[PDB]
Amino acid sequence: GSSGSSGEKARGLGKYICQKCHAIIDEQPLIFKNDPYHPDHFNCANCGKELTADARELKGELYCLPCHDKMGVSGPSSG
Ligand SMILES: [Zn+2]
Ligand SMILES: [Zn+2]
């Protein structure tokens, strides 16, 4: 037969485990540096509010959609 062992199955579909507090992430898991995290742990840098799971990163930092949107604004844009 197959040297060793064969015959195991598992479907423990839980949720994203926060790589910070090691606690289930019911809500959308905040991905940072290729790792799950809570969007409540970190806070914006501009306003200073509770970031979100879809919080965009800026040079290592993390800003909230609200602020982030108020960043990509300008008049005459030339690619
Ligand atoms: Zn956490
Ligand atoms: Zn903000």
Swiss-Prot record:
<feature type="domain" description="LIM zinc-binding 3">
    <location>
        <begin position="18"/>
        <end position="67"/>
    </location>
</feature>
<comment type="subunit">
    <text>Component of the heterotrimeric IPP (ILK-PINCH-PARVIN) complex composed of ILK, LIMS1/PINCH and PARVA; the complex binds to F-actin via the C-terminal tail of LIMS1 and the N-terminal region of PARVA, promoting F-actin filament bundling. Formation of the IPP complex is dependent on protein kinase C and precedes integrin-mediated cell adhesion and spreading. Competes with LIMS2 for interaction with ILK. Interacts (via LIM zinc-binding 5) with TGFB1I1. Interacts with SH3/SH2 adapter NCK2, thereby linking the complex to cell surface receptors.</text>
</comment>
<protein>
    <recommendedName>
        <fullName>LIM and senescent cell antigen-like-containing domain protein 1</fullName>
    </recommendedName>
</protein>
<comment type="function">
    <text>Within the IPP (ILK-PINCH-PARVIN) complex, binds to F-actin, promoting F-actin bundling, a process required to generate force for actin cytoskeleton reorganization and subsequent dynamic cell adhesion events such as cell spreading and migration.</text>
</comment>
